[PDB]
Amino acid sequence: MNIVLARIDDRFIHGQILTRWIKVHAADRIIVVSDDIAQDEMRKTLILSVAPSNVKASAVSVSKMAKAFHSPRYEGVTAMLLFENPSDIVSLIEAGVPIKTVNVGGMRFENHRRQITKSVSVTEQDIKAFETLSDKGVKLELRQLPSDASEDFVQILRNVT
Amino acid sequence: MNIVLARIDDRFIHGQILTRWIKVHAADRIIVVSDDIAQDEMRKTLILSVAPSNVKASAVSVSKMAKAFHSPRYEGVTAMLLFENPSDIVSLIEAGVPIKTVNVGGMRFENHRRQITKSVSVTEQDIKAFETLSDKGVKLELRQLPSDASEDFVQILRNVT
Amino acid sequence: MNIVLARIDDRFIHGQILTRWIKVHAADRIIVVSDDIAQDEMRKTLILSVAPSNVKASAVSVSKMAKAFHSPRYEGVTAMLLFENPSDIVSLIEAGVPIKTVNVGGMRFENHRRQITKSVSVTEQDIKAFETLSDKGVKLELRQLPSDASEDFVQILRNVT
């Protein structure tokens, strides 16, 4: 399977954002990878119900994604993955799915989170995982649209701790 | 969770009806609450597949709705509930979800039902539940669109028995 | 339940093809009948997510289809079935659902398949089932659109073996 973009985004299929990434990479499908969202009936449906037509969408767990990534059915398929956070990306790599770059899009603020950028807010578990990701050599970029200039997330995160 | 309208409607996501209620209350999501529909794979999909985009939709059971209503994830969220009948509304209130008013939209006729209005047909179990609903103080209104004048369902139902 | 067309198509809800059959028969719902697709979470969603609105869609197994076909809820309902292959059509008939004609649309080529027409490729199991289908008296037709002239599949398949 050809993974064209792995993106982090708390809000998922919001506004014209995701559509713009799609038109640009010409992807066949969007897959939300998250164990929580895959076992939660009220949230799997509700996420995949505002995704664009002419585009297949589905929500699976880190385990099925791992299995699907290697399955021959989707051989050559062009996809774009959506993640709620950086740990499931780590969990997915520890299942044998190579992810070259990750586009950090947004992680909504909460009272126990630490705002790092206008759109990204992290916890302690989030930071460890962003670390581990640079350790596995994964490029970490920050931007909403294909037209915003790519900022380096690593430099941004470090200047904060 | 902010419940802006609890509606009874046998036919669900039919015509422009539901869309009109949505534009008017500006709701983020539509949730179908029914135990039968939530365990029936051929009906959960089939109901939520003709719902409008720009609107998240999902079908849960009286039990998960109860749980979700109080969950902090959906805190402040604006929703509109859809019901097949008045018993599940009673069942939902006996789970701790306060419903102020209920908009009776339609309950299709059947051979063992008693037609009460052009669009509502009830059974004996339906009537008991509409009673219990006025007992819990729930306002019961009748109308299809936000523009039809609100008729009183209670007075209408009583004039029939 | 009134079955207006039973169609074989590996690619499912692709292009304007299916929509054209729908407008022509005026069907309320599209049901994908397949045991594999019904138990595969990443594929049930992903198939039914690119189907047209104003049309209810769902994916069930040969067993539930059998059950639904006879259920009184969907009495009189007008539907169109989608199949991945000819065996599940046989499996469905051995459950008590009469299918008069089957429209062969496409079965994508693979390395272990034998191309029979520009769009149909079969295996040994496929052929036996197409046989059994002519044995049960099921008319087998070939065409993509309601406007292409109906070719006979049986004559086409035989000229190949």
User: For tokens 């304007």, what's the residue?
Assistant: C16
| Cβ contact A65:A94 at 8 Å | no
- Cβ separation B46–C64 shorter than 8 A: no
Which residue range is the domain that position A83 belongs to? Answer: 1-161
Whole-number Cα distances in Å, C152 to C103, C134, C143, C155: 10, 12, 9, 6
CA pseudo-torsion sign C42, C47, C50, C55:
negative
The two beta strands, C2-9 and A78-83, are unpaired
User: Which residue of B42, B43, B49 is in closest CB contact with C51?
Assistant: B49
- Cβ separation B46–C29 shorter than 8 A: yes
Residue type, C127: I
Which residues in chain A touch residue C49, judged by CB atoms under 8 angstroms apart?
Answer: 48, 51, 53, 55-58
Q: Is C51 on the interface with B (CB under 8 A)?
A: yes
- Cβ separation C58–B50 shorter than 8 A: no
3-state SS, residue C104: strand
In 10 A of CB A125, how many CB atoms? 10
Q: Is C68 on the interface with B (CB under 8 A)?
A: yes
Q: How far apart are CA B154 and CA B142, in angstroms?
A: 9
Phi and psi, residue C5, nearest 5°: -170, 135
Whole-number Cα distances in Å, C74 to A48, C78, C120: 27, 9, 32
Q: How far apart are CA A135 and CA A50, in angstroms?
A: 35
Q: How far apart are CA C127 and CA C105, in angstroms?
A: 15
What total of structural domains would you count in chain A? 1
| Cβ contact B66:C85 at 8 Å | no
Residue type, A112: H
Helix axes B62-70, A41-48, angle to 10 degrees: 80
**The pair of three-digit structure tokens given for residue A70, joined into one six-digit string:** 């290697």
Whole-number Cα distances in Å, A156 to A104, A140, A151, C88: 12, 10, 8, 55
Q: Return the ∠ at Cα A107 (arms to A105 and A112), rounded to 5°.
A: 160
User: For tokens 């003709």, what's the residue?
Assistant: B50
Q: How far apart are CA B135 and CA B154, in angstroms?
A: 11
Q: How far apart are CA A159 and CA A157, in angstroms?
A: 6
| Cβ contact A134:A41 at 8 Å | no
Which residues in chain C touch residue B41, judged by CB atoms under 8 angstroms apart?
Answer: 38, 58, 60, 64
Resolution value, angstrom units = 2.9
Cβ within 8 Å of residue A33, ≥6 positions away: A59, A60, A61, A62, A65, A81, A82, A83, A88, A89, A92
Q: Which residue of A has its CA nearest to B44?
A: A45
| Cβ contact B140:B100 at 8 Å | no
Measured in residues, chain C has a length of 161
Q: How far apart are CA B108 and CA B12, in angstroms?
A: 11
- Which of A11, A17, A18, A45 best tests the B interface by mutation, with the highest count of B CBs <10 A? A45
CA distance B50 to chain C (A): 5
Q: How far is CA C132 from the centre of its chain?
A: 16
- Cβ separation A43–B58 shorter than 8 A: yes
Residues of C with a catalytic annotation lie at 14
The two beta strands, C114-115 and C121-122, are antiparallel
Question: Residue C6: in which H helix or E strand, if any?
Answer: strand C2-9
- Cβ separation A64–C47 shorter than 8 A: no
Helix axes A62-70, C41-48, angle to 10 degrees: 80
Question: Residue A46: in which H helix or E strand, if any?
Answer: helix A41-48
Q: How far apart are CA B139 and CA B151, in angstroms?
A: 11
Closest to B91 measured CA to CA, from B11, B6, B22: B6
DSSP-assigned letters across all residues of chain B: -EEEEEEEETT-S-TTHHHHHHHHHT-SEEEEE-HHHHH-HHHHHHHHTSSPTTSEEEEE-HHHHHHHHH-STTTT-EEEEEESSSHHHHHHHTTT----EEEEEEB---TTSEE-SSSBEE-HHHHHHHHHHHHTT-EEEE-SSTTSPPEEHHHHHHTT-
| Cβ contact C11:C58 at 8 Å | no
CATH of the domain at C126: 3.40.35.10
**The pair of three-digit structure tokens given for residue C104, joined into one six-digit string:** 């062969």
CA distance A115 to chain B (A): 19
Q: Is C54 on the interface with A (CB under 8 A)?
A: no
User: For tokens 């189907």, what's the residue?
Assistant: C51
Residue type, B71: S
CA distance B31 to chain A (A): 9
